[PDB]
A paper describes a structure:
Here, erythrocytes infected by late blood-stage parasites adhere to placental chondroitin sulphate A (CS) via [name]-type [name] erythrocyte membrane protein 1 (PfEMP1) adhesion proteins. [name]-type PfEMP1 are ~310 kDa large, multi-domain proteins embedded in the erythrocyte membrane. They are composed of a short and conserved intracellular domain, a transmembrane domain and a large, polymorphic ectodomain. Extensive efforts to resolve the molecular basis of [name] binding, established the CS binding site to be contained within the region spanning ID1-DBL2-ID2.
To understand the molecular details of [name] binding to [name], we determined the cryo-EM structure of [name] Fab in complex with the full ectodomain of [name] (variant FCR3) at an overall resolution of 3 Å and with resolution of the binding region reaching 2.5 Å. The [name] Fab was found to bind the globular [name] core structure away from the main surface-exposed CS binding site, which has also been suggested as the main entry point to the core-traversing CS-binding pore. The antibody bound a concave face of the [name] core structure with an epitope spanning exposed residues of ID1, DBL2, ID2 and DBL4. The binding is stabilized by hydrogen bonds, electrostatic and hydrophobic interactions. In ID1, residues K510 and R511 form hydrogen bonds with both light and heavy chain residues of [name] D47 (CDR-L1), N111 (CDR-L3) and T126 (CDR-H3). [name] residues Y51 (CDR-L1), Y110 (CDR-L3), and T72 (CDR-L2) form hydrogen bonds with [name] residues D906, D907 and N908, and [name] R120 (CDR-H3) forms an electrostatic interaction with [name] D907. In DBL4, [name] D49 (CDR-H1) forms electrostatic and hydrogen bond with the side chain of R1617 from [name]. Finally, [name] Fab binding to the DBL2 and DBL4 domains is further stabilized by hydrophobic interactions at residues K914-T918 of DBL2 and K1872-E1875 of DBL4. Contact residues in ID2 and DBL4 as well as residues L905-N908 and K914-T918 of DBL2 were all ~100% conserved. Overall, the sequence and structural conservation of the [name] epitope explains the previously observed broad cross-reactive nature of [name] and suggests that [name] would bind most of the [name] variants with high affinity.
Residue numbers in the entry:
A (entry chain A): 1664 to 1990
B (entry chain A): 228 to 415, 496 to 541, 554 to 735, 749 to 1059, 1092 to 1209
C (entry chain B): 21 to 241
D (entry chain C): 21 to 232
């Protein structure tokens, strides 16, 4: 049912036979991997639900003489290894769960009278990158899609449209809307990116025995989070193993590689950039070229918004408190 | 790709040569075309009718003349000595009669010479095929020349015709010539036990215990009855990390440039033999016809290897001790095991010919058994030859080991067995040996740094003549050992590249094995605890038994941790070989200095960040002995720079910063707040005129970003307090109360920047007053906190259309103050509440 | 560089007790910790060990299941929870650090704490009882007699005993405590003096049982 | 995993070479550390990795290893090296310490000044027996004490206490406390302590009568 509702979230929002389908399939892969980690006890979230679920799963798969390592091993090989016997083929618990995911997607597609996507047709699902890395890729993909969305909005709306900005799509009051969306969406993303990069820098190339938490990150060798995401977001999203793409992000509208160091002095340190994804720092600090074209009027209209919205807040505190002053 | 590495690809296989005689070129001489990755065969552009002039002809030749050459298995089945009572049934009535008939029958082999070779060579039926009505059709366009050159016209050209096809291998004994001159020198079923050998790939925790499965086959052994010893009479020095052994030493194609081949391994005796029949100079002919005969040769070669190791380590690499020679002997023993099992990961001139001859030996002798290509039983013949060789080595290894010890000396009083190191993959053995070398050299290079460069008699003291004479020169010796490329100070080990580069290659390979070995299909028994787990086979006979192949070993080696060479190496290394500085392989020191001097990442000392402050992050392969970052290169760290390793208060902001930095400035135009890791563009081309200045907008953005981030940060380190509550002789003298006293300094800078920004609105709001444009700190911070609420508790800030929460207001005014133009305190109080620890004061209890 | 333990206490048999160990200038985040106990007048014995990230906790075979070890790095402490304590676990418990940061629980213990007594018994902190030991003309051996007092049944935490307010130092052989069958400690504090000096000066032995705040100052003939 | 350390009471004199052995049952190849503990203090780690002398330790110590035999060697025994040495191994699981070897100063043989301190009248009022035999300034440490209640053997009713080797003279003092009830106290007449010491030609009897 999670797969069903997740497909219902992604696919009908935009009818791109691939883009919507591929995004939904990547989201379902992520949700399935998170379910796997909840079962295996590797999940990073102990919320109101998963905390008690984790404790009682430890009870179910535990015993008197079973330590934490033994219990985690028991959960892991109950999930991964075929700990179910059926009159059908040798289905492991992982396979049954993935088949349930597929069934939910089929229900949703039947309801929409669409065609079952070729992705989600894969019978076997590859290894799960460590939960933090999967979430990092999700963060990057979401950031980049929303970045293209918001920046194209501000491009065609606030900073001069193809129609003489003074006579553009803005009366200088709805351009404020686009710049407000961009600046307001950008600000928290900068703190989130700082936190995730600081965690990556202490987590990469760590085994189980070295990582602060018990899970291993040996598979991720890359000096910086930007280099890792450069290797990862390099391609075009398909549904398997590449759940993120980054086009024209940061400053310029080309792909890898616009200026290679192969012709001057090896090598080119990206690798590969998908926009010199170092620009992630520049774009989050509003120093990229793309925003620098828009920097002036975005800031000035932001100040106008601050001024008027503050003339409103000052009279609303006194409004509903009504004890100090007017309104 | 189906073929395994030992499968000896293209078997066109004369001794480093063939029918188109060549020298050492590549692994067409003589294996592994799949890894060769080009197409090395042209039997396919051999036209399909010439490949029927092969398929009729040369396929006949090989497989069916082999039916009378090697599937004429031998005439050794006379069975004369022993009398037989009962047989149960008779099936071989036609076997031997049609076997001798099988070269005398006019109806199966004279009806395979002058009837079927009437289609092969004596073509009476389809005579030198002329024209086909019930015969072959050719597509002459590319095969027409063959008609003239072989069938029914002129047939004279170079070896371009004959010699490369297998022509005379079938008892061609023309003797029409006599030679009187003498060009001669002086004249001249099976048993199958299975075990649980306890490998100790460790000495430390090792969550689970290792146990590999090996197959003893006592019928493949000498007979019994140990020690016996007397016979005799039977210099590289550069880890060759190179590769693809073009034809010289090096590593297989799949480990190329990846782990480095020890000089000991490339110098071991067996690997320096293109034969086992060459084991003795005196004897110059085949010697191995029985299992014991084959074994005695291995005994000889192992004994001579022991002799060599004695001649080399005691006392030329040994100091009169035994541990060094013992370790070298263990490693050589394991390398012998891999070299005869065929699973070695390296090559030279003699390997890939030794392996061929070894396959022929383990072939004939012992061959019979192997046959259960499809099998059905497990005591049973060894399925494939490779497993038979593995079983031969798993037995019979006792004798080789004792031979090795005899070859050294030990044998009673200096030996006091069978080390299980031969059950560890050659990759990991090479890694361990290379690291032990590096640690030996590092220990040498670190002894003197410790003696000299501890500040005066400890790493921390008065800097008074830190370099008592030049202890910085000792630190520089250590730097040139770590960073240089083997010529400017670098030691033995790496071959022309820095230790950092070689370690990176090792890590890449190790993780390649980890991912492959459990994203696999077939592997050995697990105890599930790790990452890349999806493969079909995780097998065993008894409880907890790994399948003894590389993937199974990397399955048990993972799954107890040890997913990285750092952790594996910390688990297996002895104790303290890394040097007097207690530098663990698991900690990661990120060092950063003048670009590695000899082989360069795109510069030496001026192109980039890595050029002068080189960012690389290995384990303590670092360019300082793990604690002397400051003991070397004098005076001890300041309290401020002990934050950079305490690292609870990191480095992002500078001029206005929770993050320990600044860039200035001190004037009107224009003190600014800088973010570390990104550069502000001082270009005023971003802007226009008579509005907010060119530098004013970039300031305002940097300042509002600073505001938001540092408020979040001070709340993280104050309410959470990074732990509650609250928060040296504590952590709150250094690294705390150290940035709190920074925030005040640089909120003052930011307060100076913003009162002076309202004074740049004595440069800009004197143009634009009174909108006041831009509003003062009080009002702007008020707006900032109110936005902070409206954004993420009010479903997006743009919901500011309706502002009333109608009872949140009391909390909101308590947090945010009343009557804006009063919002200086919304931050100052957070600094006057950047207190209650510094304050500190007392404290209460 | 500075480890102190808390929780040393007298507990009923079969009870529970939680020891704690702090840390000083020591970076108590990537060093393994260990707990080592020493019974009175016996040899040290490893008890527990915990990794740097607390993912690896090892216990001595005897104290297993009954002992739990844990870290708290932000508080910079390491705790040992003890349950089902027997009369044999009475020991001085030290907390120690590896001298090498590593990924293992057990290692060479470089820095040790002062330790805490964890005396386990069913006693009642009863005060001492002083008994004199009269000499004799027989004890005048080689011109030298001996005078002493024995402290009996003074559990817990053995006592300081002096002679003549610490005036006498030579010959004072105060024997170590001993746990007799009743569960109460006892000792003697004899001292050898010239037999000629017998009856000439006065001898008083002074006992100070801090746990019971008992001060007994007995003159001996 | 055990760690058999021997000898347990090695004696020596200043200037001698002292060797301590710490045989390990299993293979620990060199994960062994040596600890020195003086009376009434925390242990001090001298050697780790079985040979690597810890910084600040006097260089007269050394540690070497042969297979699973680890030996700590003090080349020149000094009066500040009189302590117990422990040889704790720390390879993997139980990290167990050794039994503990206690060095002592070796001096000339002496003889205990035996005493037969009898119970006191107010101790009788208390109701138990506090018969105490005292052995003073004797050496070597080995000495046996026996109790004869009217020349009858006693066992399980006496207790033993020993002082540590006294610093000024390297002599030992021993105290034997014999405890009896009132009933079996006045049930007998003569109480004797028998001292069996290597420095005594014959066992020495010290007795008294309750009426004496």
């Amino acid at each position: 049912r999670e797969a069903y509702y997740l497909w219902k979230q992604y696919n009908p929002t935009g009818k791109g036979i691939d883009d919507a389908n591929k995004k939904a399939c990547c989201a379902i892969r992520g949700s399935f991997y998170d379910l796997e980690d909840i079962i295996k006890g590797n999940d990073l979230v102990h919320d109101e639900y998963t905390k008690y679920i984790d404790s009682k799963l430890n009870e179910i798969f535990g015993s008197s003489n079973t330590n934490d390592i033994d219990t985690k091993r028991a959960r892991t090989d109950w999930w991964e290894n075929e700990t179910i016997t059926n009159g059908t083929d040798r289905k492991t618990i992982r396979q049954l769960v993935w088949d349930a995911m597929q069934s939910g997607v089929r229900y949703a597609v039947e309801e929409k009278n669409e065609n079952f996507p070729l992705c989600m047709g894969v019978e076997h699902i590859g290894i799960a990158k460590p939960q933090f890395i999967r979430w990092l890729e999700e963060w990057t993909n979401e950031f980049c899609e929303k970045y293209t969305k918001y920046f194209e909005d501000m491009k065609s709306k606030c900073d001069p449209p193809k129609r003489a900005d003074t006579c553009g799509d803005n009366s200088n009051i709805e351009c404020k809307k686009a710049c407000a969306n961009y600046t307001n969406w950008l600000n928290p993303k900068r703190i989130e990116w700082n936190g995730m990069s600081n965690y990556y820098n202490k987590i990469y190339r760590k085994s189980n025995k070295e990582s602060e938490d018990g899970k291993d990150y040996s598979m991720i060798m890359a000096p910086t989070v930007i280099d890792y995401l450069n290797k990862r977001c390099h391609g075009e999203i398909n549904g398997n193993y590449i759940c993120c793409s980054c086009k024209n992000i940061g400053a310029y509208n080309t792909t890898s590689g616009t200026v290679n160091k192969k012709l001057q002095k090896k090598e080119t340190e990206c690798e590969e950039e998908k926009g010199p994804l170092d620009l992630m720092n520049e774009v989050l600090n509003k120093m990229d070229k793309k925003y620098s074209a828009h920097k002036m009027k975005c800031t000035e209209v932001y100040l106008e918004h601050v001024e008027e919205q503050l003339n409103e807040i000052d009279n609303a505190i006194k409004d509903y408190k009504l004890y100090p002053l007017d309104r | 790709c189906g073929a395994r590495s030992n499968d000896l690809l293209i078997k066109r296989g004369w001794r480093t040569s063939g029918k188109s005689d060549r020298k050492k070129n590549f692994e067409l001489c003589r294996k592994c075309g799949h890894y060769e990755k080009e197409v090395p065969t042209k039997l396919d552009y051999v036209p399909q009718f010439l490949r029927w002039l092969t398929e009729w002809i040369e396929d006949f030749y090989r497989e069916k003349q082999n039916l009378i050459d090697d599937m004429e298995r031998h005439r050794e089945e006379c069975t004369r000595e022993d009398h037989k009572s009962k047989e149960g049934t008779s099936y071989c009535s036609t076997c031997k009669d049609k076997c001798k008939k099988y070269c005398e029958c006019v109806k199966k082999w004279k009806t395979e010479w002058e009837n079927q070779e009437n289609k092969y060579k004596d073509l009476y039926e389809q005579n030198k095929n002329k024209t086909s009505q019930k015969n072959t059709s050719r597509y002459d366009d590319y095969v027409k020349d063959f008609f003239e050159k072989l069938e029914a016209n002129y047939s004279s050209l170079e070896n371009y015709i004959k010699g490369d096809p297998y022509f005379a291998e079938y008892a061609t004994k023309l003797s029409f010539i006599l030679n009187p001159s003498d060009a001669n020198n002086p004249s001249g079923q099976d048993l199958l036990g299975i075990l649980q050998e306890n490998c100790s790939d460790n000495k430390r925790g090792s969550s689970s215990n290792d146990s590999c499965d090996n197959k003893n086959q006592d019928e493949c052994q000498k007979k019994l009855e140990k020690v016996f010893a007397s016979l005799t009479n039977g210099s590289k020095k550069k880890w060759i990390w190179k590769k693809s052994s073009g034809n010289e030493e090096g590593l297989q194609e799949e480990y190329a440039n990846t782990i480095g081949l020890p000089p000991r391994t490339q110098s071991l005796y067996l690997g320096n033999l293109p034969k086992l029949e060459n084991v003795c100079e005196d004897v110059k002919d085949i010697n191995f016809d029985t299992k014991e005969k084959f074994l005695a040769g291995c005994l000889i070669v192992s004994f001579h290897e022991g002799k060599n190791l004695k001649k080399r380590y005691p006392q030329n690499k040994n100091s009169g001790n035994k541990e060094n020679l013992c370790k070298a002997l263990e490693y050589s023993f394991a390398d012998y095991g891999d070299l005869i099992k065929g699973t070695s990961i390296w090559d030279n001139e003699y390997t890939k010919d030794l392996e061929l001859n070894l396959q022929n030996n383990f072939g004939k002798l012992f061959g019979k058994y192997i046959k259960k290509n499809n099998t059905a039983e497990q005591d049973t013949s060894y399925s494939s030859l490779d497993e038979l060789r593995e079983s031969w080595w798993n037995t019979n290894k006792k004798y080789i080991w004792t031979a090795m010890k005899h070859g050294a000396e030990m044998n009673i009083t200096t030996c006091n067995d069978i080390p299980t190191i031969d059950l560890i993959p050659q990759y990991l053995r090479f890694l361990q040996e290379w690291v032990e070398n590096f640690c030996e050299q590092r220990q040498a290079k670190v002894k003197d740094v410790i003696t000299n460069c501890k500040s005066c008699k400890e790493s921390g003291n008065k800097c008074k003549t830190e370099c008592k004479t030049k202890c910085k020169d000792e630190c520089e010796k250590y730097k040139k050992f770590i960073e240089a490329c083997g010529t400017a100070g670098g030691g033995i080990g790496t071959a022309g590249s820095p230790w950092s580069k070689r370690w990176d290659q090792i890590y890449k390979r190790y993780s390649k094995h980890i991912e492959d070995a459990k994203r696999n299909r077939k592997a050995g028994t697990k105890n599930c605890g790790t990452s890349s787990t999806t493969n079909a086979a995780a097998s065993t006979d008894e409880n907890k038994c790994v399948q003894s192949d590389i993937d199974s070993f990397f399955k048990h080696l993972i799954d107890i941790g040890l997913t990285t060479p750092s952790s594996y190496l910390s688990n297996v290394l002895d104790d303290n070989i890394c040097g007097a500085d207690k530098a663990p392989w698991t900690t990661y020191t990120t060092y950063t200095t003048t670009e590695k001097c000899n082989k360069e990442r795109d510069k030496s000392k001026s192109q980039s960040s890595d050029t002068l402050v080189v960012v690389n992050v290995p384990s303590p392969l670092g360019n300082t002995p793990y604690r002397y970052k400051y003991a070397c290169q004098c005076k001890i760290p300041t309290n401020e720079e002990t934050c950079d390793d305490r690292k609870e208060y990191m480095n992002q902001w500078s001029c206005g910063s929770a993050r320990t930095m600044k860039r200035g400035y001190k004037n009107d135009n224009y003190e600014l707040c800088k973010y570390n890791g990104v550069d502000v563009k001082p270009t005023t081309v971003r802007s226009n005129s008579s509005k907010l200045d060119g530098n004013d907008v970039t300031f305002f953005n940097l300042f509002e970003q600073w505001n938001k981030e540092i408020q979040y940060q001070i709340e993280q380190y104050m309410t959470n307090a990074n732990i509650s509550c609250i928060d040296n002789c504590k952590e709150k003298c250094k690294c705390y109360k150290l940035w709190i006293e920074k925030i005040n300094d640089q909120w003052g800078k930011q307060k100076d920047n913003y009162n002076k920004f309202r004074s740049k609105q004595i440069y800009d709001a004197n143009k634009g007053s009174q909108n006041k444009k831009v509003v003062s700190l009080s009002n702007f911070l008020f707006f900032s906190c109110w936005e902070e609420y409206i954004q993420k508790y009010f479903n997006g800030d743009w919901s500011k259309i309706k502002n009333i929460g109608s009872d949140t207001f009391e909390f909101l005014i308590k947090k945010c103050g009343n009557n804006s133009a009063h919002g200086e305190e919304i931050f100052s109080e957070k600094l006057k509440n950047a207190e209650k620890k510094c304050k500190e004061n007392e404290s209460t209890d | 560089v500075r480890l102190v333990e808390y929780g040393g206490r007298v507990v009923r048999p079969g009870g529970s007790l939680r020891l704690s160990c702090a840390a000083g200038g020591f970076d108590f985040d990537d060093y393994g910790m260990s707990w080592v106990r020493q019974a009175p007048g016996k040899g040290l014995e490893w008890v527990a060990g915990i990794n740097w990230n607390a993912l690896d906790k090892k216990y001595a075979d005897s104290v297993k299941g009954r002992f739990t070890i844990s870290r708290d790095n932000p508080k910079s402490s390491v705790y040992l929870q003890m349950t089902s304590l027997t009369a044999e676990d009475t020991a001085l418990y030290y907390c120690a650090r590896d001298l090498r940061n590593s990924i293992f629980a057990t290692g060479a213990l470089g820095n040790w704490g002062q330790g805490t007594l964890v005396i386990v018994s069913s006693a009642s902190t009863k005060g001492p009882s002083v008994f004199p030991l009269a000499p004799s003309s027989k004890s005048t051996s080689g011109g030298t007699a001996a005078l002493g007092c024995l402290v009996k049944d003074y559990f817990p935490e053995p006592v300081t005993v002096s002679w003549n307010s610490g005036a006498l130092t030579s010959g004072v052989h105060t024997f170590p405590a001993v746990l007799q069958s009743s569960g109460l400690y006892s000792l003697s504090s004899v001292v050898t003096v010239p037999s000629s000096s017998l009856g000439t000066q006065t001898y008083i032995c002074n006992v100070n049982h801090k746990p019971s705040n008992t001060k007994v100052d007995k003159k001996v003939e | 995993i055990q760690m058999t350390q021997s000898p347990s009471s090695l004696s020596a004199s200043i200037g001698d070479r002292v060797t301590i052995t710490c045989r390990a049952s299993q293979d620990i190849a060199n994960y062994l550390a040596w600890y020195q503990q003086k009376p009434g203090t925390v242990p001090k780690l001298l050697i780790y990795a079985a040979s690597t002398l810890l910084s600040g330790v006097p260089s007269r110590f050394s540690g070497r290893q042969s297979g699973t035999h680890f030996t700590l060697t003090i080349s020149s025994l000094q009066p500040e090296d009189v302590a117990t040495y422990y040889c704790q191994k720390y390879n993997n699981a139980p990290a167990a310490f050794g039994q503990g070897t206690r060095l002592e100063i070796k001096r000339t043989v002496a003889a205990p000044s035996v005493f037969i301190f009898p119970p006191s009248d107010e101790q009788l009022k208390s109701g138990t027996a506090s018969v105490v035999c005292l052995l003073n300034n004797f050496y070597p440490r080995e000495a046996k004490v026996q109790w004869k209640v009217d020349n009858a053997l006693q066992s399980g009713n006496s207790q033993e206490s020993v002082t540590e080797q006294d610093s000024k003279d390297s002599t030992y003092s021993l105290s034997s406390t014999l405890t009896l009830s009132k009933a079996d106290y006045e049930k007998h007449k003569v109480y004797a302590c028998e001292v069996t010491h290597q420095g005594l030609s014959s066992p020495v009897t010290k007795s008294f009568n309750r009426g004496e």
